[PDB]
Structures are given as structure tokens and as C-alpha cells.
Design a protein around this motif. Structure first.
Motif, PDB file in Angstrom:
ATOM      1  N   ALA A 162       0.791  -1.209   0.000  1.00 24.91           N
ATOM      2  CA  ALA A 162       0.000   0.000   0.000  1.00 24.91           C
ATOM      3  C   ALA A 162       0.838   1.281   0.000  1.00 24.91           C
ATOM      4  CB  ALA A 162      -0.904   0.051   1.234  1.00 24.91           C
ATOM      5  N   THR A 163       2.167   1.261   0.102  1.00 26.26           N
ATOM      6  CA  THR A 163       2.903   2.507   0.174  1.00 26.26           C
ATOM      7  C   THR A 163       3.236   3.041  -1.200  1.00 26.26           C
ATOM      8  OG1 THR A 163       3.806   1.551   2.112  1.00 26.26           O
ATOM      9  CG2 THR A 163       4.853   3.604   1.315  1.00 26.26           C
ATOM     10  N   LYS A 164       3.053   4.345  -1.412  1.00 28.75           N
ATOM     11  CA  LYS A 164       3.370   4.991  -2.672  1.00 28.75           C
ATOM     12  C   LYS A 164       4.810   5.516  -2.587  1.00 28.75           C
ATOM     13  CE  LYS A 164      -1.362   6.594  -2.832  1.00 28.75           C
ATOM     14  NZ  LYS A 164      -2.214   7.728  -3.164  1.00 28.75           N
ATOM     15  N   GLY A 165       5.574   5.570  -3.659  1.00 30.03           N
ATOM     16  CA  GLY A 165       6.899   6.158  -3.607  1.00 30.03           C
ATOM     17  C   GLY A 165       7.383   6.472  -5.018  1.00 30.03           C
TER      18      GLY A 165
ATOM     19  N   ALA B  95      17.736   5.065  -4.782  1.00 27.39           N
ATOM     20  CA  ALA B  95      17.034   5.426  -3.573  1.00 27.39           C
ATOM     21  C   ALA B  95      15.552   5.297  -3.856  1.00 27.39           C
ATOM     22  CB  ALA B  95      17.341   6.867  -3.227  1.00 27.39           C
ATOM     23  N   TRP B  96      14.671   5.230  -2.885  1.00 25.09           N
ATOM     24  CA  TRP B  96      13.260   5.412  -3.120  1.00 25.09           C
ATOM     25  C   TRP B  96      12.757   6.245  -1.944  1.00 25.09           C
ATOM     26  CZ3 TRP B  96       8.630   3.474  -0.761  1.00 25.09           C
ATOM     27  CH2 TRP B  96       8.828   2.586   0.293  1.00 25.09           C
ATOM     28  N   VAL B  97      11.813   7.104  -2.265  1.00 27.62           N
ATOM     29  CA  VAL B  97      11.187   8.092  -1.377  1.00 27.62           C
ATOM     30  C   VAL B  97       9.796   7.612  -1.036  1.00 27.62           C
ATOM     31  CG1 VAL B  97      10.410  10.489  -1.351  1.00 27.62           C
ATOM     32  CG2 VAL B  97      12.541   9.895  -2.402  1.00 27.62           C
ATOM     33  N   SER B  98       9.406   7.409   0.219  1.00 29.85           N
ATOM     34  CA  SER B  98       8.053   6.989   0.528  1.00 29.85           C
ATOM     35  C   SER B  98       7.256   8.257   0.708  1.00 29.85           C
ATOM     36  CB  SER B  98       7.975   6.173   1.803  1.00 29.85           C
ATOM     37  OG  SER B  98       8.854   6.668   2.801  1.00 29.85           O
ATOM     38  N   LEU B  99       6.138   8.241   0.006  1.00 34.88           N
ATOM     39  CA  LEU B  99       5.250   9.366  -0.145  1.00 34.88           C
ATOM     40  C   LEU B  99       4.058   9.217   0.770  1.00 34.88           C
ATOM     41  CD1 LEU B  99       5.250   9.384  -3.999  1.00 34.88           C
ATOM     42  CD2 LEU B  99       6.427  11.063  -2.565  1.00 34.88           C
ATOM     43  N   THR B 100       3.497  10.353   1.174  1.00 36.15           N
ATOM     44  CA  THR B 100       2.252  10.282   1.922  1.00 36.15           C
ATOM     45  C   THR B 100       1.091   9.876   0.988  1.00 36.15           C
ATOM     46  OG1 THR B 100       1.810  12.552   1.527  1.00 36.15           O
ATOM     47  CG2 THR B 100       3.122  12.120   3.422  1.00 36.15           C
ATOM     48  N   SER B 101      -0.046   9.490   1.553  1.00 37.39           N
ATOM     49  CA  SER B 101      -1.192   9.014   0.810  1.00 37.39           C
ATOM     50  C   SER B 101      -1.864   9.998  -0.123  1.00 37.39           C
ATOM     51  CB  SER B 101      -2.223   8.514   1.792  1.00 37.39           C
ATOM     52  OG  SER B 101      -1.626   7.434   2.503  1.00 37.39           O
ATOM     53  N   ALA B 102      -1.634  11.307   0.011  1.00 37.17           N
ATOM     54  CA  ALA B 102      -2.290  12.319  -0.811  1.00 37.17           C
ATOM     55  C   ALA B 102      -1.676  12.510  -2.202  1.00 37.17           C
ATOM     56  CB  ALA B 102      -2.245  13.637  -0.066  1.00 37.17           C
ATOM     57  N   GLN B 103      -0.519  11.892  -2.438  1.00 35.67           N
ATOM     58  CA  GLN B 103       0.195  12.030  -3.679  1.00 35.67           C
ATOM     59  C   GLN B 103      -0.453  11.084  -4.665  1.00 35.67           C
ATOM     60  OE1 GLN B 103       2.098  14.661  -3.155  1.00 35.67           O
ATOM     61  NE2 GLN B 103       1.828  14.407  -1.025  1.00 35.67           N
ATOM     62  N   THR B 104      -0.444  11.501  -5.902  1.00 35.45           N
ATOM     63  CA  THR B 104      -1.119  10.831  -6.996  1.00 35.45           C
ATOM     64  C   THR B 104       0.013  10.318  -7.836  1.00 35.45           C
ATOM     65  OG1 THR B 104      -2.831  12.442  -6.882  1.00 35.45           O
ATOM     66  CG2 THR B 104      -2.721  11.208  -8.967  1.00 35.45           C
ATOM     67  N   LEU B 105       0.236   9.019  -7.847  1.00 36.06           N
ATOM     68  CA  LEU B 105       1.276   8.402  -8.650  1.00 36.06           C
ATOM     69  C   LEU B 105       0.751   8.266 -10.045  1.00 36.06           C
ATOM     70  CD1 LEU B 105       2.203   5.388  -6.494  1.00 36.06           C
ATOM     71  CD2 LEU B 105       3.239   7.620  -6.477  1.00 36.06           C
ATOM     72  N   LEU B 106       1.526   8.579 -11.076  1.00 39.20           N
ATOM     73  CA  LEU B 106       1.038   8.479 -12.417  1.00 39.20           C
ATOM     74  C   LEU B 106       2.031   7.715 -13.237  1.00 39.20           C
ATOM     75  CD1 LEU B 106      -0.159  12.128 -12.766  1.00 39.20           C
ATOM     76  CD2 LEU B 106      -1.609  10.020 -12.702  1.00 39.20           C
TER      77      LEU B 106
ATOM     78  N   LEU C 200      14.229  -2.176  -8.226  1.00 43.12           N
ATOM     79  CA  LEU C 200      12.905  -2.697  -7.967  1.00 43.12           C
ATOM     80  C   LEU C 200      12.999  -3.959  -7.158  1.00 43.12           C
ATOM     81  CD1 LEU C 200      11.130  -2.275 -11.461  1.00 43.12           C
ATOM     82  CD2 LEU C 200      11.012  -0.830  -9.516  1.00 43.12           C
ATOM     83  N   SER C 201      13.876  -4.908  -7.454  1.00 43.36           N
ATOM     84  CA  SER C 201      13.910  -6.105  -6.648  1.00 43.36           C
ATOM     85  C   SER C 201      14.561  -5.869  -5.294  1.00 43.36           C
ATOM     86  CB  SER C 201      14.608  -7.185  -7.447  1.00 43.36           C
ATOM     87  OG  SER C 201      15.877  -6.798  -7.895  1.00 43.36           O
ATOM     88  N   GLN C 202      15.577  -5.020  -5.194  1.00 43.92           N
ATOM     89  CA  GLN C 202      16.195  -4.756  -3.922  1.00 43.92           C
ATOM     90  C   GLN C 202      15.202  -4.290  -2.882  1.00 43.92           C
ATOM     91  OE1 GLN C 202      19.735  -2.211  -3.598  1.00 43.92           O
ATOM     92  NE2 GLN C 202      19.664  -2.569  -1.404  1.00 43.92           N
ATOM     93  N   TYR C 203      14.341  -3.342  -3.265  1.00 35.61           N
ATOM     94  CA  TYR C 203      13.374  -2.822  -2.309  1.00 35.61           C
ATOM     95  C   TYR C 203      11.984  -3.392  -2.487  1.00 35.61           C
ATOM     96  CZ  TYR C 203      17.127   0.621  -1.787  1.00 35.61           C
ATOM     97  OH  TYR C 203      18.308   1.311  -1.629  1.00 35.61           O
ATOM     98  N   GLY C 204      11.779  -4.367  -3.378  1.00 39.59           N
ATOM     99  CA  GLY C 204      10.489  -5.028  -3.542  1.00 39.59           C
ATOM    100  C   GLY C 204       9.409  -4.080  -4.030  1.00 39.59           C
ATOM    101  N   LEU C 205       9.732  -3.264  -5.035  1.00 44.01           N
ATOM    102  CA  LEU C 205       8.830  -2.213  -5.499  1.00 44.01           C
ATOM    103  C   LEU C 205       8.159  -2.645  -6.789  1.00 44.01           C
ATOM    104  CD1 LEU C 205      11.396   0.605  -5.120  1.00 44.01           C
ATOM    105  CD2 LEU C 205       9.341   0.235  -3.615  1.00 44.01           C
TER     106      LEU C 205
END
Length: 198
Positions: free
Chosen positions: A27-30, A65-76, A188-193
Motif C-alpha cells: 500500500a505505500t506509494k513512492g 534510492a526510493w522516497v516513501s510518499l504520503t497518501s495524498a500524492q497521486t502516482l502516475l 525494484l527487486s532490492q526494495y520489492g517495489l
């Protein structure tokens, strides 16, 4: 903010880098970006608003790196190309000689070809190994930005370039440029994204 590859974000109200790609982890956006852009827990802002924090990074050695975003961000599923967009369709790695483009907040959207793989960059902080080289031009500030084929396959995130006194390598012939990116698949595989695509 709408999260699109190529756009500017700041780190701890000081450095600037460019967004690489929208990702989810459960469920986390980044978004993935370059490791040298921030340290873990550095605050990322887009358009003056806090959008999230650096969750993990590796620099030097690798540059990711990956940045974890709050829920209000709209990933596109998109990368910026001027006023238009390139849709992210997947992440098939392209081979040497393939045409590739990159998006960043300093030189915008530039294209070139992949010229070599597994290059070592010797940065001030230490060496970074296993980078892919392209001859699309780039400048300071473009780091973190997306590399993507015109067909929508996400290749990696901008690491570094042999920039000249003007801050980019756009003013020297393509034959002489060395613009490097960190491949996306190991990030992607390192952080399971998972990549957001459309």
C-alpha cells in the motif's frame, strides 16, 4: 502533487534532483530516484510542499534510492516530455545501440542511444559500478530523472554526466558525452517495489 517522471523535487530545502518513476510497495506509494540525492529520512518537497521522505538509499557503490510518499500524492505512469507525456509501459531492459531518452528538470527531455553497459563512474564520494552509458545530454539537477525508451520501457535513473563549465554536456558532440544511469531492475527487486504502468 502528481508524481510524473522528470519533475523537480528538493531535498531538505537545499539540493534539487528529478523524480525517476512512480512505484508502490504494498500500500505505500513512492518514487525511485538517485541515491546521491539524499540520505535516509531527508524530506522531499515538490512545489514547496512536503511529499515524503527518503526511505532507503545506496550511494556510492550503487546509486539508487526510493522516497516513501504520503497518501495524498497521486502516482502516475508518466514521464514528462515538455508539455506532453511518455507512458511507462514496463521495464524491459534495452540493449546497447537502442535509442533512449531521459527527462529531468534542468535540460528537460533529451534522447540519444545506449553506448555501453557496466561502466564505473569515479565520483568524489567513491566509485559507483555497473552503470549504463548513453549519449543523450544532461546537466546538474537532472540526477534521479527517468531514462525510458520512446516505446515506454523504463530503463533506469540518472546518475551522472561529464558536465562542462556550463553545467551540462549538451554543448559537446554526442560522441563525447557520457551520461550514466543506474538500471531500474535491481532497484525494484532490492526494495520489492512495483512500477506503476498504464
Amino acid at each position: 502533487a502528481n508524481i510524473v517522471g522528470g519533475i523537480e523535487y528538493s531535498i531538505n530545502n537545499a539540493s534539487l534532483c528529478s523524480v525517476g518513476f512512480s512505484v508502490t510497495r504494498g500500500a505505500t506509494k513512492g518514487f525511485v530516484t538517485a541515491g546521491h540525492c539524499g540520505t535516509v529520512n531527508a524530506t522531499a518537497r515538490i512545489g514547496g510542499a512536503v511529499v515524503g521522505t527518503f526511505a532507503a538509499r545506496v550511494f556510492p557503490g550503487n546509486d539508487r534510492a526510493w522516497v516513501s510518499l504520503t497518501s495524498a500524492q497521486t502516482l502516475l505512469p508518466r514521464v514528462a516530455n515538455g508539455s506532453s507525456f511518455v507512458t511507462v509501459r514496463g521495464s524491459t531492459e534495452a540493449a546497447v545501440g537502442a535509442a533512449v531518452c531521459r527527462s529531468g528538470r534542468t535540460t528537460g527531455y533529451q534522447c540519444g542511444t545506449i553506448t555501453a553497459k557496466n561502466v564505473t563512474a569515479n565520483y568524489a564520494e567513491g566509485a559507483v559500478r555497473g552503470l549504463t552509458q548513453g549519449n543523450a545530454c544532461a546537466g546538474r539537477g537532472d540526477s534521479g530523472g527517468s531514462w525510458i525508451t520512446s516505446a515506454g520501457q523504463a530503463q533506469g535513473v540518472m546518475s551522472g554526466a561529464n558536465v562542462q563549465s556550463n553545467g551540462n554536456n549538451c554543448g559537446i558532440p554526442a560522441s563525447q558525452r557520457s551520461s550514466l544511469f543506474e538500471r531500474l531492475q535491481p532497484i525494484l527487486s532490492q526494495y520489492g517495489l512495483s512500477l506503476v504502468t498504464g
